[PDB]
Amino acid sequence: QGPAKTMEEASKRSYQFWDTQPVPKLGEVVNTHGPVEPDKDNIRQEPYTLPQGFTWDALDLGDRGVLKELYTLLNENYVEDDDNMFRFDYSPEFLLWALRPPGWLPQWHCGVRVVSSRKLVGFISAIPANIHIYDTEKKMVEINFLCVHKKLRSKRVAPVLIREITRRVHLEGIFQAVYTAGVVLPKPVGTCRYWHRSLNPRKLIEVKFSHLSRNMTMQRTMKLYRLPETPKTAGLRPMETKDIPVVHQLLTRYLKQFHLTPVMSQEEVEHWFYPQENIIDTFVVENANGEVTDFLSFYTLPSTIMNHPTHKSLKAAYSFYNVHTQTPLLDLMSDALVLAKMKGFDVFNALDLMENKTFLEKLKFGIGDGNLQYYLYNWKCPSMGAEKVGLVLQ
């Protein structure tokens, strides 16, 4: 009845819900490419039944009060590290960025409330995304922010949330989805791992996010992670409106080399990369000819430090999409670290996907304890190595 972190531990587990879903079995190897089941031509019109005393409510995130209720649900009940020491603390303005990209739909912001008190106790979301998977491009959704209030857990409310968002996506004619999780489910198309780059090692060690390496003093740890005060790449500057087309061009061409990627329109590129303070940072390299040849980006996602008397929060930057054509990726990411340090971040996180393994050890990242499993719903295809995953979710 409890989740699994490893593929061998998950293989002895029973998946009463996921056995009912159009996903491959954990045990079988996938030899084909295509949908698990044909598209449905008649879709259930009625919402799935919730347990007595709870009701569906679609959340208007343009209402400041409602957005704050969602902030609070996530702030108090969303994903923790496996030791229950830190919890994601997505900000209201970040949530609006992640949940209202181009094509967002109100019915896909799927809340659960207590009938009597109106308290928000559950959420799940879908946003539309065009996804390139091996040799197929298809319209899908990305599922994120699945959250059940701690007091409502282990009562089969999450399967109801999954079925209800599935139904609402089916009604719009979409039959595939992509999603990620730290737990093992049937069946990962790719397995990634977070790595962490200390920026403020003293704070990270004090709050036990990080620990002193074997036979290393704090003084040595400070010198080890020390960074230059300014970046080194010539012509590095924040992305501006005039850069939207070339950033779209660079990204589109760069992503062709991977096997699971988004296909963004120019409007989606504007949404996902145009800088917004405390949400998304994008820096381009404009060379001596005035041409933009590279860019780096990272998003802002702090965590709550639970039950700590002094340090309440950790400011974390997450590597987003980094595109190099003239500047070495190593130099780009070195400058990303310098920029994050300048902007007050305590740690810089990056997955081992795309080409990130080429710089992780060199730039003094340390391996994390969390896997990031990538999944497709209703799509059969062979799994891929982390290096071929070219998709980053919020």
Binding site: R87, F88, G182, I367, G370
Partner: peptide
């Protein structure tokens, strides 16, 4: 992506 990691 619904996975909270910290260094091993």
């Amino acid at each position: 992506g619904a996975s909270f990691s910290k260094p091993r």
